[PDB]
Amino acid sequence: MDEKLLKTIAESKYLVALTGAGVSAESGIPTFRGKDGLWNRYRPEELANPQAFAKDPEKVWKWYAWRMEKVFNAQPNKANQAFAELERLGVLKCLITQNVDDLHERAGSRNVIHLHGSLRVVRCTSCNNSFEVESAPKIPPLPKCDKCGSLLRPGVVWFGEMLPPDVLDRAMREVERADVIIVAGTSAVVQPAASLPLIVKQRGGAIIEINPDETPLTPIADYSLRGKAGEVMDELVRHVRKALSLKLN
Ligand SMILES: Nc1ncnc2c1ncn2[C@@H]1O[C@H](COP(=O)(O)OP(=O)(O)OC[C@H]2O[C@H](O)[C@H](O)[C@@H]2O)[C@@H](O)[C@H]1O
Numbered sequence: 001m002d003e004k005l006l007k008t009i010a011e012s013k014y015l016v017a018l019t020g021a022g023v024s025a026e027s028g029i030p031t032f033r034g035k036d037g038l039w040n041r042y043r044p045e046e047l048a049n050p051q052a053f054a055k056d057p058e059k060v061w062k063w064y065a066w067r068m069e070k071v072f073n074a075q076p077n078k079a080n081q082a083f084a085e086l087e088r089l090g091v092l093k094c095l096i097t098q099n100v101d102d103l104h105e106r107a108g109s110r111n112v113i114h115l116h117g118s119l120r121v122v123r124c125t126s127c128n129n130s131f132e133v134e135s136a137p138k139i140p141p142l143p144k145c146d147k148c149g150s151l152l153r154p155g156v157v158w159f160g161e162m163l164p165p166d167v168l169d170r171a172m173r174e175v176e177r178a179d180v181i182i183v184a185g186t187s188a189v190v191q192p193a194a195s196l197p198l199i200v201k202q203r204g205g206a207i208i209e210i211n212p213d214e215t216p217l218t219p220i221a222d223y224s225l226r227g228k229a230g231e232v233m234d235e236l237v238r239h240v241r242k243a244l245s246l247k248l249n
């Protein structure tokens with residue numbers, strides 16, 4: 001929270017952000033890793049991969065329907081509001097997220113890229129039918145496609161699956177032109193998402209990491225703020241808004 005940091009953000013020409021589960025934590029949604037992380041209680045090998053889904057689609061669907069209900073009923077937090085505001089001010093150009101929740105959207109964020117899909121989306125395992133839901137389905141019975149009758153599945157990316165090419169490519173273009181990237185609430189271990197901030201640095205840009213813990217990205221982060229996204233982003237955006245308002249124009 002020094003002058004240089006504020007300056008780096010306020011004067012940026014193309015600032016982007018990469019967010020992870022930590023940015024939704026203050027909305028009552030647990031993260032995947034860490035203390036009370038979902039992967040520390042539930043096994044990703046049974047709930048986050050095509051093999052597990054094929055083996056027991058009812059169990060996987062029951063788990064996702066539960067997660068969907070949790071997310072749809074949660075409200076965006078201060079971190080979410082701050083990111084939307086930073087975009088409103090014209091500073092944040094694009095928000096790249098690994099989150100499958102829609103808290104960024106409900107806070108007002110517009111240019112959001114969902115690298116790993118979205119819990120709002122349901123798609124067919126056979127044909128190209130896909131659509132969004134307003135609330136979570138009840139399981140059983142297994143959600144079936146109204147077009148061909150095959151099993152439907154959550155529109156999220158599982159381990160071993162390829163992120164949609166057009167989606168990752170868009171994110172790639174964003175980080176290739178960003179001079180500053182805010183990396184908040186992510187453990188920086190899951191690929192290829194974890195590689196995006198490196199692009200910014202390699203091309204000459206700056207990395208501003210926001211996370212209560214240190215991660216594999218910390219060593220190359222120009223700035224690494226040890227705190228919660230809500231508190232840090234709220235203060236950061238407020239100072240940036242103040243700085244911009246002070247400009248003689
Ligand atoms: N209030 C908070 N503010 C900011 N960061 C926080 C907060 N609370 C926790 N964190 C940080 O959030 C990070 C979350 O790490 P992960 O649980 O691994 O979430 P993420 O990096 O988004 O996961 C990547 C991907 O893997 C998952 O399988 C899934 O597909 C996911 O998108 C942690 O480093 C943690 O310290």
Ligand SMILES: [Zn+2]
Nearest residue numbers: 124127145148
């Ligand atoms: Zn179908």
